[PDB]
Amino acid sequence: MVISRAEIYWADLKRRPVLVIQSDPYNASRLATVIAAVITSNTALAAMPGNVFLPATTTRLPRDSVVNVTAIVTLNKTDLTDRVGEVPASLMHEVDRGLRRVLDL
Amino acid sequence: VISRAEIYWADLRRPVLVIQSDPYNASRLATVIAAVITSNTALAAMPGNVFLPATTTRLPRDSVVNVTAIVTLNKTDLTDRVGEVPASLMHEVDRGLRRVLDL
């Protein structure tokens, strides 16, 4: 599977969902690792500055979701198994804004 | 005393977020401008709209500010002041309003 950015996968971190934030050039490369943000089901975390809410009707996930931009993980490309769905470019811009906010970029 | 960023219950009962500036709110103007707050969280996919967790608004369910649904209500139609939206989430609301209104 060619893992791409904005995609949501189930990952054993406790299988939990993750959002791929590593750029596609590095994804389509021979690098064995991919960087991702952990997706929580605690919608109250959408109040944290930078975090992005994700409705289940958009993600194809079971419940409503929140991208925790303060929870960043590096996973092996083999650890990504269940491709749940893709986050629209409008919501990924909100994610991109949050990442630059928390990382000072 | 209606102030901006406050959430009120409005007579159909649905919640609204005051977006009219406080100068116009503290005036004798009989109207106040607000954005309609929905409980259909799927509307958070809309570009300008802003999600609001119930733990933040003091509302019953999770909320989404629909910045494309803007209303002008009489100040008497606002009865139950639920709570206030933090300035960080209201900055997101302001971004959506300027986006949809080209401001």
């Binding site: 629209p88 | 259909n40 809309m46 803007i70």
Partner: peptide, 23 residues
């Protein structure tokens, strides 16, 4: 304006909160 249009197809049903706005 595809971004707005994409989100509209996601919510196949329209919210009655936006209807009350017209009113």
């Amino acid at each position: 304006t595809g971004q707005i249009d994409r989100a509209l197809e996601s919510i196949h049903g329209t919210d009655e909160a936006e209807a009350l706005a017209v009113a």
